[PDB]
Q: What sequence folds into this?
């Protein structure tokens, strides 16, 4: 490294080099921090985590017991050891607490004052963070597997909601209009994800092994259906053009939004060109998932090389996105891992799991 | 609507008078009898279709063509009150040298109106679904091009729907419909761009009969359309309960998440 400091100091390399190279080095050194803990408040498994996009200070967490916990990730104590204390909590006694498992929880992008949470009680509740009261409730006729707000939409404030119904619901938080539906899937939609690049592109993955990208502005159905083979097995599209050979229970756009990572119960991850849905043929080997619900996985941001952190049974498997090389498998959970979320400021990873624990992975040294 | 553009487009004055016609003696008798008839009673019991009754009632209010009664041939004007009113109006307007546009939801009644206008010296041009389609646009153009043609009988179904009839000045809606949109487009045939003369709309209705209840229906519909097209603060239609007692005769005499949450709280406070 001292070469890196000297190169930054003398202008030989752009400081961007030291940032990104060091960010990468930090990601490769991710290790279970026993010098950091997260306060145990979930009686049930953690299904979802969400670090706020602005300032990355707070984390939401949704449990199988229906409670939403709001953690503070800043070490406000002077010690080197600290527990991420829980600021608020939608507990068992809150009048608005979810009746069943909270399946997704998300900060409103652009502002920390509001977050949204969807459950198996068939509701997507919008919360005022400050008063911690629901501002809105959208009821669905069918259990919600995942929702997602656009990280980029300064213009629209739609929430895409995937339920066991075959239809994708768009809920407009600006005047509450939960009628709009995207039609074209055939089984439960297990994962929805807005593009981080395009304001109105939504990718939706379903148990029918198909992933569709939508232009929700458009009135003419899906843009693209991801196809494993890109045409080697080509059929008049009625059942072909499956992204996977099982259910597709996970979606994640890469940071710059130019590629799409899908994980399905064929124990594969694929990398897709988000513009024409073409398969890049990145291998990734075998990625064990048998989750019957959505599988929440993330990518890294602001490193020399992009990484994807995928729950792999009871571990987090780290892969290089564009080459497939498995960096490492982070082994610290006791039961299957449900969600991992990436803290882009410090290359920290938080992962919840069915054993009612949230483990912080921080770079070593 | 034609209020956000009126100052920027300069249309002439429009009027929407309504006339509550009074049913004549023979008309009253046939109506009073048929409401008391066993057929209406059975319809009230739901034994068969209501539509038959509604047709019959509308016909009665429209002319006694249930039963036909020299100078008392079928389609006689004096036999039905609305025709008396039409006579008076067309008389005054013909004296005004003005072009009239008379609409009727029915087609056979348009025929009785036609024979009437023969009985008068009113030069008309009739246009319904039976008039040939190819002769349609030339008929409209003809009526619009010269003022010789005085009145213009029209069935509302072809008479509405995109034809331009700026030539006519006075519009009278002779027969109500269950559909407000029908009569609305009918009356709106005149008051368009290019109407360089004032136009008034007369809705001829039979007080206390079926036609008033149909009027109530189409008002309630119009309010429902207003509640969702022009503004949701519509006033509740308090006049009627709108039941199946319409068979009676009762003649007169980025948003920063606080704007969002504020908006949400507003909506969910209601």
A:
């Amino acid at each position: 490294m001292l070469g890196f400091l000297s190169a930054r100091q003398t202008g030989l390399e752009d400081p961007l080099r030291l940032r990104r190279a060091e960010s990468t080095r930090r990601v490769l050194g991710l290790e279970l921090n026993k010098d950091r803990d997260v306060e145990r408040i979930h009686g049930g498994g953690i299904n979802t985590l969400d670090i706020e996009p602005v300032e990355g200070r707070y984390m939401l967490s949704g449990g199988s017991d229906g409670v939403i916990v709001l953690y503070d990730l800043e070490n406000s104590s002077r010690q080197s050891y600290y527990t991420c204390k829980a600021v608020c909590s939608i507990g068992r006694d809150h009048p608005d607490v979810h009746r069943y498992s909270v399946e997704t929880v998300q900060w409103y992008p652009h502002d920390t004052g509001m977050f949204t949470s969807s459950s198996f009680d068939k509701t997507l509740k919008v919360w005022d963070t400050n008063t911690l009261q629901t501002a809105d409730v959208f009821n669905f006729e069918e259990t919600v597997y995942s929702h997602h707000m656009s990280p980029v939409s300064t213009k629209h404030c739609l929430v895409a909601v995937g339920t066991r119904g075959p239809k994708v619901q768009l809920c407009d938080l600006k005047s509450g209009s939960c009628s709009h539906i995207l039609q074209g899937h055939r089984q439960e939609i297990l994962a929805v994800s807005w593009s981080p690049r395009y304001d109105y592109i939504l990718a939706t993955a379903s148990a029918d092994s198909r992933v569709k990208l939508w232009d929700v502005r458009r009135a003419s159905g899906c843009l693209i259906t991801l196809d494993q083979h890109n045409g080697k097995k080509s059929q008049a599209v009625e059942s072909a053009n499956t992204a996977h050979n099982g259910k597709v229970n996970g979606l994640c756009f890469t940071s710059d939004g130019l590629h799409l990572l899908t994980v399905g119960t064929d124990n594969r991850m694929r990398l897709w060109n988000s513009s024409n849905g073409e398969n890049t043929l990145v291998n990734y080997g075998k990625v064990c998932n048998n989750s019957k619900k959505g599988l929440k996985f993330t990518v890294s941001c602001g490193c020399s090389s992009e990484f994807v952190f995928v729950p792999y049974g009871s571990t987090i498997a780290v892969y290089t996105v564009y080459s497939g090389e498995q960096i490492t498998m982070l082994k610290g959970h006791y039961k299957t891992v449900d969600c991992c979320v990436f803290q882009s400021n410090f290359q920290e990873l938080y992962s919840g799991s069915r054993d009612c624990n949230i483990l912080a992975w921080v770079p070593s040294l | 609507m034609k209020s956000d553009v009126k100052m920027s487009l300069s249309l002439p004055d429009k009027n929407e008078q309504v006339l509550f016609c009074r049913l004549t003696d023979e008309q009253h008798k046939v109506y009073q009898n048929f409401v008391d008839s066993k057929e209406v009673y059975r319809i009230l019991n739901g034994e068969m279709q209501i539509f038959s009754g509604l047709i019959a009632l509308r016909k009665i209010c429209n002319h006694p063509d249930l039963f036909s009664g020299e100078e008392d041939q079928f389609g006689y004007w004096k036999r039905s009150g609305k025709m008396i009113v039409v006579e008076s109006l067309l008389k005054i307007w013909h004296k005004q040298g003005q072009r009239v546009l008379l609409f009727s939801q029915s087609r056979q009644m348009l025929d009785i109106l036609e024979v009437f206008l023969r009985a008068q010296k009113y030069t008309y041009l009739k246009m319904d679904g039976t008039t040939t389609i190819a002769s349609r646009q030339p008929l409209i153009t003809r009526y619009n091009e010269d003022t010789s043609i005085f009145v213009f009988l029209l069935t509302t179904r072809v008479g509405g729907l995109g034809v331009n009839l700026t030539g006519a000045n006075r519009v009278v809606i002779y027969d109500p419909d269950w559909n407000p949109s029908t009569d609305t487009q009918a009356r709106e045939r005149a008051w368009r761009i290019g109407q360089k003369k004032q136009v008034t709309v007369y809705r001829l209705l039979t007080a206390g009969t079926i036609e008033e209840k149909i009027y109530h229906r189409q008002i309630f519909k119009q309010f429902l359309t207003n509640r969702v097209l022009k503004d949701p603060k519509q006033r509740r239609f308090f006049k009627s309960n709108d039941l199946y007692e319409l068979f009676t005769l009762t003649s007169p005499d980025p948003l920063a998440s606080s704007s969002l949450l504020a908006k949400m709280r507003a909506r969910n406070h209601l």
